[PDB]
Amino acid sequence: AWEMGVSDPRKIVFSAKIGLALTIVALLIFYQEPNPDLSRYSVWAILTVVVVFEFTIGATLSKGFNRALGTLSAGGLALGMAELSTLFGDWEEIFCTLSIFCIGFLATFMKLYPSMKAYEYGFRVFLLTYCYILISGFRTGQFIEVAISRFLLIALGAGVSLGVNMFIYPIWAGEDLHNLVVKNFMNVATSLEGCVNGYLRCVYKGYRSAVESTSQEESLMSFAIWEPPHGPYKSFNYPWKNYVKLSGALKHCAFTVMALHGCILSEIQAPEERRQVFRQELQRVGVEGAKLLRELGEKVKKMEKLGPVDLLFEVHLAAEELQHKIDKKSYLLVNSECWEKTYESASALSLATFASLLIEFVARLQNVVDAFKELSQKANFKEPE
Amino acid sequence: AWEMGVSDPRKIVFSAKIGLALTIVALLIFYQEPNPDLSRYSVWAILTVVVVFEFTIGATLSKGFNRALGTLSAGGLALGMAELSTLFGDWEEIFCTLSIFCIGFLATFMKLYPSMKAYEYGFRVFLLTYCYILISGFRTGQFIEVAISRFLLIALGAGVSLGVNMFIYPIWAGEDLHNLVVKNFMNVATSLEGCVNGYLRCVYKGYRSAVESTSQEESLMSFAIWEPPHGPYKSFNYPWKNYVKLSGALKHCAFTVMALHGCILSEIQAPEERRQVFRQELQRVGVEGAKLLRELGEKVKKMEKLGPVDLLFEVHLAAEELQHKIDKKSYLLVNSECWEKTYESASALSLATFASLLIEFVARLQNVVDAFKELSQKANFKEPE
Numbered sequence: 230a231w232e233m234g235v236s237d238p239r240k241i242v243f244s245a246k247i248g249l250a251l252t253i254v255a256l257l258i259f260y261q262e263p264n265p266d267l268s269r270y271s272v273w274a275i276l277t278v279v280v281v282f283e284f285t286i287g288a289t290l291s292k293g294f295n296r297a298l299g300t301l302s303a304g305g306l307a308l309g310m311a312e313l314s315t316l317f318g319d320w321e322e323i324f325c326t327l328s329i330f331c332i333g334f335l336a337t338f339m340k341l342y343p344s345m346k347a348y349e350y351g352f353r354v355f356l357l358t359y360c361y362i363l364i365s366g367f368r369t370g371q372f373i374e375v376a377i378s379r380f381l382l383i384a385l386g387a388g389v390s391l392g393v394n395m396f397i398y399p400i401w402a403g404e405d406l407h408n409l410v411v412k413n414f415m416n417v418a419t420s421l422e423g424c425v426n427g428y429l430r431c432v433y434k435g436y437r438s439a440v441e442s443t444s445q446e447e448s449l450m451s452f453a454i455w456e457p458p459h460g461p462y463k464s465f466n467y468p469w470k471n472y473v474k475l476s477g478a479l480k481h482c483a484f485t486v487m488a489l490h491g492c493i494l495s496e497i498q499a500p501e502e503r504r505q506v507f508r509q510e511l512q513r514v515g516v517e518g519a520k521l522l523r524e525l526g527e528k529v530k531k532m533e534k535l536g537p538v539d540l541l542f543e544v545h546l547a548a549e550e551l552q553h554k555i556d557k558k559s560y561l562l563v564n565s566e567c568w569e570k571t572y573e574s575a576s577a578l579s580l581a582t583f584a585s586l587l588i589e590f591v592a593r594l595q596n597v598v599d600a601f602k603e604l605s606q607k608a609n610f611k612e613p614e
Numbered sequence: 615a616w617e618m619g620v621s622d623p624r625k626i627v628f629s630a631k632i633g634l635a636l637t638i639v640a641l642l643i644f645y646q647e648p649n650p651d652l653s654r655y656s657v658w659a660i661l662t663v664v665v666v667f668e669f670t671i672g673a674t675l676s677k678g679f680n681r682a683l684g685t686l687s688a689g690g691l692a693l694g695m696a697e698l699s700t701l702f703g704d705w706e707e708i709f710c711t712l713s714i715f716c717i718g719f720l721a722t723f724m725k726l727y728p729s730m731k732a733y734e735y736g737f738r739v740f741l742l743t744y745c746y747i748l749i750s751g752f753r754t755g756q757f758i759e760v761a762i763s764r765f766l767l768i769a770l771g772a773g774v775s776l777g778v779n780m781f782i783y784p785i786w787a788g789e790d791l792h793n794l795v796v797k798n799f800m801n802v803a804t805s806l807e808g809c810v811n812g813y814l815r816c817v818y819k820g821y822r823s824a825v826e827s828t829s830q831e832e833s834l835m836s837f838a839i840w841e842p843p844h845g846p847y848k849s850f851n852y853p854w855k856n857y858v859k860l861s862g863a864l865k866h867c868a869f870t871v872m873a874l875h876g877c878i879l880s881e882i883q884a885p886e887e888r889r890q891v892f893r894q895e896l897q898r899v900g901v902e903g904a905k906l907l908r909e910l911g912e913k914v915k916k917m918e919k920l921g922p923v924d925l926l927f928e929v930h931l932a933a934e935e936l937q938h939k940i941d942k943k944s945y946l947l948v949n950s951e952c953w954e955k956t957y958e959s960a961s962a963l964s965l966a967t968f969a970s971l972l973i974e975f976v977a978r979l980q981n982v983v984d985a986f987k988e989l990s991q992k993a994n995f996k997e998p999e
């Protein structure tokens with residue numbers, strides 16, 4: 230309660246905005262209209278204000294658009310069917326009751342496909358409006374008054390939500406994508422040092438969050454293409470996809486840290502005395518990789534270009550010293566006695582596995598650097614100077 | 615869409631069952647009332663039918679219980695406020711708007727907590743019913759005549775939905791969990807064979823499905839506890855929690871196949887001439903591991919116990935043969951002229967990493983066999999005669 234409120238004040242502003250929007254969609258009902266029935270059709274505005282008010286502006290825009298489309302398509306369909314029913318007499322309330330089964334079946338079948346998982350609420354509003362329009366106006370024949378009334382109540386319930394969301398302390402999805410891209414670099418940098426220290430002593434979230442967030446970055450990128458230009462992002466087509474490309478480049482490197490963490494938790498291990506012969510080189514490689522990842526995160530946070538100097542020189546030299554040391558003491562990994570216990574040999578080879586994995590991690594960084602250069606060039610970052 | 619219908623005929627009966635329930639509600643409203651009231655309040659039965667129909671019986675029962683608690687908790691609070699607002703005479707219209715503001719704020723703050731994210735469907739029902747029962751009876755005082763005429767249409771909708779869902783082709787979540795476990799056992803074996811075949815040439819779906827579904831198993835287990843005993847699952851408390859343990863053991867075994875697939879896509883690779891020296895042992899270990907996994911999958915599907923003979927003897931012999939072979943040719947993996955280029959040394963050292971990862975995969979199977987024995991004992995599996 231109070232702890233979460235103090236930690237993040239964005240959710241108290243969100244809750245107060247929802248309260249304000251409801252209090253307005255209620256004062257308008259009380260005073261702006263004295264009609265008796267006006268107060269029974271209040272559910273078509275409250276459902277709208279409870280289904281379209283979202284955390285970000287782009288999600289609210291998308292949901293509003295979808296709801297409008299659904300309602301209009303099903304009001305047109307309902308009107309057309311109600312007209313066409315009269316053609317054959319005596320078949321009334323039977324040819325209207327045989328179309329609800331076919332519309333509900335087509336709607337559900339179309340709603341269960343995997344591609345259409347971002348329109349789940351416009352199919353429900355389509356079915357609800359079709360059935361309501363057909364059933365309500367059957368006895369009296371008045372279908373257009375019901376259609377128009379309900380549509381106006383939905384635009385009256387969606388425009389106050391959009392105004393309140395956009396004008397009182399807006400939250401943007403593009404800035405959330407920018408901050409998640411910044412955060413992943415630090416999580417991976419912490420994970421690598423955690424793994425190396427854990428293996429050399431006498432993590433999970435760091436690589437999991439980067440390896441388990443592609444969907445979040447694709448939804449945040451689907452909401453960011455709806456928002457108008459604002460703040461630091463002034464072009465009319467911001468390259469929001471190069472952020473996803475850089476995030477994927479970083480996930481490809483985080484899979485090796487996941488494999489090193491799995492190397493720490495194995496059934497077959499090596500004697501500590503043997504591992505303490507390579508401590509210096511491994512600690513150097515870990516320090517250099519953490520420095521590089523933190524420098525790339527800092528340069529992405531400030532929207533700056535890369536300098537003239539090469540950033541991978543020191544990590545490359547550290548990995549070359551590691552290779553030289555491994556070449557100088559290779560007699561502690563293989564059994565030289567036999568040359569033409571299984572546990573002892575597996576314990577010996579688990580150290581060569583750990584070293585090979587660290588070298589592969591150091592070899593996968595150039596792709597991340599290239600993706601960063603491409604993003605810094607398409608997004609017009611400023612000169613480091 | 616026709617193809618999706620032929621691949622899963624389970625999706626063509628759900629749509630026809632929803633259509634049939636909607637048609638039954640339509641007929642009851644059309645023929646069992648001579649007054650428009652049941653036609654004018656007919657949006658509540660349609661909304662209930664579209665909201666409360668789920669793929670499984672246990673999800674329908676649990677979500678219906680949680681949706682029937684929010685409506686009965688939001689219907690008494692609105693009548694207590696509408697009865698306590700009389701005291702504040704004259705200024706009795708501001709106390710009814712400050713309560714919509716307070717309830718809105720509180721319900722959104724509670725819904726934003728990170729442990730309540732799974733119950734976002736009960737807070738919407740609570741907020742909608744409170745706001746409707748407070749904005750609908752304001753100008754007349756008929757607060758108890760608006761909460762009793764709208765609850766029988768929701769009882770009609772819930773009853774029709776429950777009868778049609780439970781009595782026409784019921785779908786059970788325990789069978790879904792059983793089939794998921796069998797499918798994961800098959801997929802891991804196919805991925806294991808694919809990895810070795812791809813490495814020795816002159817995968818994603820399996821481990822990616824068996825490592826990214828724990829949430830699905832937890833949801834299916836949460837739904838299967840509400841269902842009554844049926845078919846082969848005849849017991850008051852079926853041990854549905856012993857399936858998740860076996861799934862977790864299989865996920866721990868599949869992280870090594872994911873590390874071997876990552877070994878295939880590495881930037882540093884070993885020469886083919888040195889790879890072909892160890893072809894026989896790797897092929898044998900792959901054949902044995904795939905046969906063992908498929909045998910355990912067939913034993914799980916048929917609900918049968920393990921026999922007298924040991925199931926791990928041949929894979930345990932193959933691993934020892936591979937170890938002996940590696941011991942006899944270890945001079946091909948290291949440089950023995952420096953004992954006291956980097957790319958060549960790393961390429962030589964990658965083969966030992968592939969071999970060590972296969973040995974670790976072979977070492978992780980005892981835990982899965984123990985989990986299977988525990989499940990076969992707690993669930994009263996039958997003798998494998």
Ligand SMILES: CCCCCCCCCCCCCCCC(=O)O
Pocket residue numbers: 661662665666678679681682685738739742765768769772
């Ligand atoms: C999501 C917006 C609110 C939707 C309101 C319609 C759902 C009605 C509340 C659920 C009740 C269904 C459970 C059985 C109810 C009963 O036994 O009376």
Ligand SMILES: CCCCCCCCCC
Pocket residue numbers: 685686687688689690743746747760761762764765
């Ligand atoms: C204590 C009685 C609960 C009243 C809830 C009735 C729900 C009415 C739906 C608008």
Ligand SMILES: CCCCCCCC
Pocket residue numbers: 300301304305308358376377379380
């Ligand atoms: C678009 C045809 C007129 C009816 C639309 C009503 C929307 C509910």
